[PDB]
Amino acid sequence: TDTTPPTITLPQEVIAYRGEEFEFFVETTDDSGRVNRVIVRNIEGADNSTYLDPNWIRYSTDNLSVPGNATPANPLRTRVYGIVPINHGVGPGDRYTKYVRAEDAAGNITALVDKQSERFVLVIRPQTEKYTPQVPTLTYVQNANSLTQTDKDAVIAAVKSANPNLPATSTYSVSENGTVTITYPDGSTDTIAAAQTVDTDRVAPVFVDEGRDYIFYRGEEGTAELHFYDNSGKITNVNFAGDLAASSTYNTLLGLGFTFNTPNINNPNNATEQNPLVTTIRGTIPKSLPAGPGGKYTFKVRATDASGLTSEAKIFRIVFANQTDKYTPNNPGSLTGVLNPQQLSTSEKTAIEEKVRAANTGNLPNNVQYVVNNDGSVTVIYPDDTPASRSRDTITADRTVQDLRPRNS
Ligand SMILES: CC(=O)N[C@@H]1[C@@H](O[C@@H]2O[C@H](CO)[C@H](O)[C@H](O[C@]3(C(=O)O)C[C@H](O)[C@@H](NC(C)=O)[C@H]([C@H](O)[C@H](O)CO)O3)[C@H]2O)[C@@H](O)[C@@H](CO)O[C@@H]1O
Ligand SMILES: CC(=O)N[C@@H]1[C@@H](O[C@@H]2O[C@H](CO)[C@H](O)[C@H](O[C@]3(C(=O)O)C[C@H](O)[C@@H](NC(C)=O)[C@H]([C@H](O)[C@H](O)CO)O3)[C@H]2O)[C@@H](O)[C@@H](CO)O[C@@H]1O
Ligand SMILES: [Ca+2]
Ligand SMILES: [Ca+2]
Ligand SMILES: [Ca+2]
Ligand SMILES: [Ca+2]
């Protein structure tokens, strides 16, 4: 008959964190295939004892005392689980050696032998041994020895952002110099040193487009996109009117009807090199301003970061261009026969103008003017043309006129 007790397989050590749920499994088999009892108990007590302390160590075994419940293929599974109290000690003696016994249906029970038979040690550790926080992105501040509440909130946010797997019940404290204390729910802590959380902001924002000339064609609306970034990733102000000369130029452009829009100025993380802050300048230089050496506005812009560092005044320009600088007429698809190449008739001029018109729809402005000259060359006058800033193209008479005079006999 069966004289062999069941075989019990279980972890020798189970680390359980203070405050948290723990669970592990004990596996029991027997050659009979049936196990009738699995017991977790204190060493103390008579052979029949099932007294077990602490009260929060719990166990359960589904399928007890069922034929076929304890085979090698399908071992009997006993769950050992509980919640460690939040105020349990985590000292070296905060451990429990408890004994697991099993009995088959023939009554064979595993022997209970102090420090030798089947047992586990449940070891209670602080939550900080489970969690290792990651360093945040550096927060750049005006004074790393005296953080503002805004600085501290930013460090906490950057620590929480880099630590999505820490307990949600974890609290964060930032000291005057940026040292971060993370307090887990059991009162254990981690520290992130100030060197890994904050540094002094010593670099003013950068105007990426310093020195750039933005071309605006007279009489056509244009835009200029200006880009800024800071080492902190944040700009708080862009200032085109930092002194009298700058202000004058700025207000002159406003006077022409331009707009300046920097929509992300109040957003966080609005100004990195990869994703810079963008100021868009939109407007039209009217034709009443001529192009030429003086046909320009030289601006000065400054940008300030959240620590109060303001860049030097940095130059960019708007430079005016005539429309002829961006348009090139297409020649007519055929020449027009002329009886007298030195003096076209009205009908010949009309025919040329029509061919030049047809060749240029979709290319030149719809409000260009064509003047067919007496020799059949065509003056193209763009709508920004003025006496002070002529804006024109010429199509030569070899591209428009074909002499029809016969050849001698
Ligand atoms: C009460 C007594 O003297 N009993 C002895 C008995 O001693 C127990 O033997 C166990 C091993 O079989 C352990 O060595 C027990 O020590 C520990 C443990 O379980 O590891 C030490 C831990 O530090 C302690 N944990 C805490 C938080 O204090 C636990 C705990 O007090 C108990 O597990 C109760 O939950 O105990 C040791 O106490 C053994 O020596 C037998 C031999 O026959 O004689 C008496 O029964
Ligand atoms: C208008 C004025 O006299 N402002 C002076 C200021 O002198 C200005 O300083 C600017 C640099 O910050 C430019 O050098 C200004 O010159 C230009 C320019 O912007 O490039 C010359 C251009 O030809 C002119 N454009 C047109 C279409 O006439 C512009 C334009 O007049 C201005 O930008 C409008 O404000 O100006 C230069 O004039 C400087 O001298 C300060 C010192 O306190 O005093 C006034 O603000
Ligand atoms: Ca057996
Ligand atoms: Ca830790
Ligand atoms: Ca900065
Ligand atoms: Ca042209």
Numbering used by the authors: 252 to 660
Question: Which sentences from the paper describe this structure?
Answer:
We therefore determined cocrystal structures of SK1BR soaked with either 10 mm sialyl T-antigen (sTa), a core 1 glycan that can be conjugated to Ser or Thr residues of glycoproteins, or 10 mm 3´-sialyl-N-acetyllactosamine (3´sLn), a trisaccharide that can be a component of larger, branched glycans. For both sTa and 3´sLn, we observed the appearance of unambiguous electron density adjacent to the noncanonical YTRY motif of both SK1Siglec1 and SK1Siglec2. Thus, SK1Siglec1 and SK1Siglec2 are both capable of binding sialoglycan ligands and can do so simultaneously. Here, the low temperature factors of sTa and SK1Siglec1 suggest that the ligand has little mobility when bound, which may be interpreted as strong binding. Consistent with the crystallographic temperature factor analysis, SK1Siglec1+Unique1 showed a statistically significant preference for sTa. Upon ligand binding, the temperature factors of all loops become more similar to the temperature factors of the Siglec domain core in both SK1Siglec1 and SK1Siglec2 (compare A and B with C–F).
The serine-rich repeat (SRR) adhesins are a family of bacterial cell-surface glycoproteins containing two sequence motifs where serine constitutes ∼50% of the sequence. The binding region from S. sanguinis strain SK1 (residues 252–660 and termed SK1BR) differs from structurally characterized Siglec-containing binding regions in two ways. First, it contains two copies of the Siglec and Unique domains in tandem (SK1Siglec1-SK1Unique1-SK1Siglec2-SK1Unique2) with sequence identity/similarity of 39%/56% between the two Siglec domains and 44%/50% between the two Unique domains. The second way that SK1BR differs from other structurally characterized Siglec-like binding regions is that each of the putative Siglec domains of SK1BR contains a noncanonical YTRY sialic acid–binding sequence motif that lacks the central Thr-Arg deemed to be critical for binding in other Siglec-like adhesins.
